[PDB]
Amino acid sequence: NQCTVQVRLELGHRAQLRKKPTTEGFTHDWMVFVRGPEQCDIQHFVEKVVFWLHDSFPKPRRVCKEPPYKVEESGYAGFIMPIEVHFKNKEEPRKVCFTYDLFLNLEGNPPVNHLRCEKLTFNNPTTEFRYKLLRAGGVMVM
Numbered sequence: 001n002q003c004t005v006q007v008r009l010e011l012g013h014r015a016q017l018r019k020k021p022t023t024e025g026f027t028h029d030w031m032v033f034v035r036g037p038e039q040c041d042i043q044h045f046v047e048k049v050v051f052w053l054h055d056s057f058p059k060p061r062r063v064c065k066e067p068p069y070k071v072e073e074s075g076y077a078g079f080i081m082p083i084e085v086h087f088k089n090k091e092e093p094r095k096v097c098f099t100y101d102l103f104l105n106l107e108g109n110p111p112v113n114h115l116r117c118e119k120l121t122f123n124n125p126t127t128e129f130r131y132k133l134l135r136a137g138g139v140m141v142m
């Protein structure tokens, strides 16, 4: 009737210098992901994650319909990556779009290993979607 459910997402990325021929253009390997915290299963409320890569990549609309929600790639530059997390929700909101700063380690700096923790607050979710948030390890507030 009246209640808020909070769930947690973790977006992150790893990047390092690629050990390859001088004549291979891509300097870096990187990996971007969405996950839950330890012993939460976001798959209960996440229908899919869509990573929107730079237009220069082949098939830059990358869909993960189940875990792991991640893209592994090679490249030569950082970019801003739209990341859409779609919900198993019959009403609004149906999804959330993050603007992810995919930056590389440049000038012989250590590997990048970044995490961005997002808190989602669902006000007054339906019965069915409430159960999914709770199954995923969501918590109620009051």
Ligand SMILES: N#Cc1ccc(C(=O)Nc2ccc3[nH]c(CN4CCCCC4)nc3c2)cc1
Residues within 6 Å of the ligand: 026, 054, 056, 057, 058, 073, 074, 075, 076, 077, 078, 079
């Ligand atoms: N602003 C800006 C900006 C412009 C371009 C890039 C970039 O690295 N492009 C790019 C373009 C094409 C690429 N194929 C691969 C390798 N992959 C292709 C098939 C899947 C597995 C290997 N890595 C690629 C990287 C990044 C930032």
